[model samples]
Target: MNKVHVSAVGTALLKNSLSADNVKKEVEDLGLKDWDRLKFDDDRQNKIRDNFTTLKDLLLNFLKSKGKEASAELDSLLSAIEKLQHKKEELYVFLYTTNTWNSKLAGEVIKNYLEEEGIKSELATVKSISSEETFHEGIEDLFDKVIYKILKFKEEGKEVYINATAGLKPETTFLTLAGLLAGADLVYYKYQEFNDVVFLPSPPITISPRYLEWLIEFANYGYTLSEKKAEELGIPVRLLEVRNLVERKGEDAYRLKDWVRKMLGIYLGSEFELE
Candidate 1:
């Protein structure tokens, strides 16, 4: 069967590429304290952004020379394909990462390296993914795009695999859950404490059908249900709060938690409008 591997891209390429002592020394010599810590002052950030192209070339060269040894993303992809006994020609890859400069650079390097290795791959950058203020919006966007692709591939009779082995912890965690809900054939991650890639078989998670109905109703009402409306629907607001499904929005309103909303959005469609 044909296969599509949707992998979360992170700075693993940057981490591994610059891990050599000589490379670390070179990076430090360039006045950067830690290459992975892209959180710098505005001036320093702009400086790096200005030189992003040059840095991209340098990292690309390093990745080319080092190959899968320099990237957890590549290693995980290869391991997953091998474990599933998938042929390279029948595989397609989607690499996604945050919108930050360093992440975009690392994603590009990984994409180029994959193509050179004869794998067809594409890269997508999730906007505001690293911003503290807009992180939830970023996750919602990621969920919408990823779930859409997963369902599309499934409809096309392709086996879908989610490589949750890289990227931010919260992002990868959500992607793993999304994959499971969207009917991915497999979801796997490389546990940092373990040398082998750990496959996550679907857990026996059962949600109340009544709760699902409430969520759909809440979504239709702009994701906010007033206490009066909850009463009208016979949904005990306090019970939902206790279940950690909804949080108080204002004096008389409650809305689904960000994670809950995103998960339901993935399962029911990004708009959460299940027909």
Candidate 2:
């Protein structure tokens, strides 16, 4: 797979760029009374490289081990990593909170690290060219921005990934839902504590257009469907079972499944009001 990594500029860069304790110790070694004149130069950048290098190595090793445990084709997985090691210019990074310097710093660090590793990277910002009012508008625009890119990437047969660690709660939550519904290859996050990556599972399930329409109609009209009502609406009886949408409620009324109802929000990009 010609994998394209998509990530968010999170605390990943700042967390490593200046290790507080490490720098403090260095300051003590230099016999400095205060850290007011600490220089952030090539040496400090090397610290950043060392930090991310360790993380990069851990990620590759973790993937290899997981692949082996899952009985994946060893040669194929290895070959993919081999290609990834030398590949250049395939990273798509999302930028948010640009008004604040935190995100911008993270973006710079992430870009610098990717370039150092021979990976080509681009910054995609949701910040509008026009003057924005608040972070809310930025987030709303970003959600649409990411979804549009996911669709475009789908057509090009490029595997798209969404970083779960970007932005605030709302931005992360909505962007993740959009990416999954738009058929992103992966929506995952790196766990610092566990030294591992946790992937959001995407199961292969097909939804019929007729079923979707029926669901919307049912939601609008009372969130219940009977056999007679199903016939009246011309909704396929078996499609409900196939999709695991509605199930028997006391042998008369059928109600939407709990999981199905909640997950529907991810596809609809709005609240799932099914009762």
Candidate 3:
């Protein structure tokens, strides 16, 4: 089975916009066939025109690229992505309006999403960012600060504490100050250059659509610990590495989310902390 790709409404809209003949014509007419015009298409002239002539061509191309011979189930998946994306955006606008949000109200909405998702998983945590860094650097920086203090003990001839290192593999979350940013540096860094790293998928968005839960949750949580933190602490920031925090751990004991489930909610109690 194809690993399920739970995408948001924006992705669906984005897909529709990209594969639409009208959108294609607009881009072709404007002579702008780059990522801004078409995020995932760079083929011969006729191939491009023929494939993008209609929605059917779009789905067919997407499936064929994935090694599938047919476009049987893409439509349903695409629709689901669009609906969820819209909801995610609405949540963001609601939280962001200057006079609209209060702490309690924000908490309630977050709690509602958690409860409704049937997310019987890890406890969430919300670490924060400082003013100095922005976006990717923000996560790397904060992680460096937190990890450095912990690591010093290792070199000082003292038994390093759990928080000082990646002891037990706890989930480290990065909540943002309003309008800061979101997602791991690893995800964004991968986009440095399409050819920087060669693998099956050139860009993340190409293979997987951004999910609604991720967009809403991401905007709320904002950036991760700054890139400085990542560098100083030697945290290998990679999209694949972050998965360890979300992956299943064990049976009623310790694991990634299990260790992290208690971290969720809206606080950073000792339980939510890395140590």
Top model number, TM-score: 1
Query: What stretches of model 1 exceed 4 Å from their correct place?
Result: 20-30, 40-49, 128-132, 191-195, 203-207, 220-232, 249-262, 271-275
lDDT of 3: 0.27
**Model 2 accuracy (lDDT, Cα):** 0.50
Query: How many residue pairs clash in each candidate at the backbone level?
Result: 0, 1, 33
- How do all the candidates rank in terms of lDDT, highest first? 1, 2, 3
Number of the predicted model whose lDDT against the real structure is largest: 1
For residues 1-275, write the lDDT of model 2, one tens digit per residue.
24555454444333332334553354345343222222334243344344544434432333333332211112222233343452444444333434223334345544544455555666565562233454546655565456656656666788766666445566667667666666777666544343344566754433456666777666765767888888798876567867677777777677766544444544564344632
Clashes of 2: 1
- Residue by residue across 1-275, what tens digits does model 3's lDDT show? 11112111112222334454665675456453442223222333233344343423433334334421121112332233243342322221111101111112222222333234432111122222223443344344333333332233223433211111111111122312100121111110111222121112112111122322331232233324333443453433344236644332233221223322322311232233443
Positional deviation of 150 in candidate 2, in angstroms?
1.6
Residue-level error in angstroms, candidate 2, position 27: 14
Residue pairs that clash (backbone atoms under 3 angstroms), model 1? none
Task: For each candidate, give its TM-score against the true structure.
Answer: 0.81, 0.48, 0.19
Model 3 TM-score on a 0 to 1 scale: 0.19
C-alpha RMSD values across all candidates = 3.4, 12.4, 20.5
Candidate 2 TM-score versus the reference: 0.48
Candidate 1 lDDT score relative to the true structure = 0.75
Question: In candidate 1, what are the lDDT values of residues 111-161, reduced to their tens digit?
Answer: 877777778888877765546777778777787667667767877888888
In model 2, the clashing pairs are 89-120
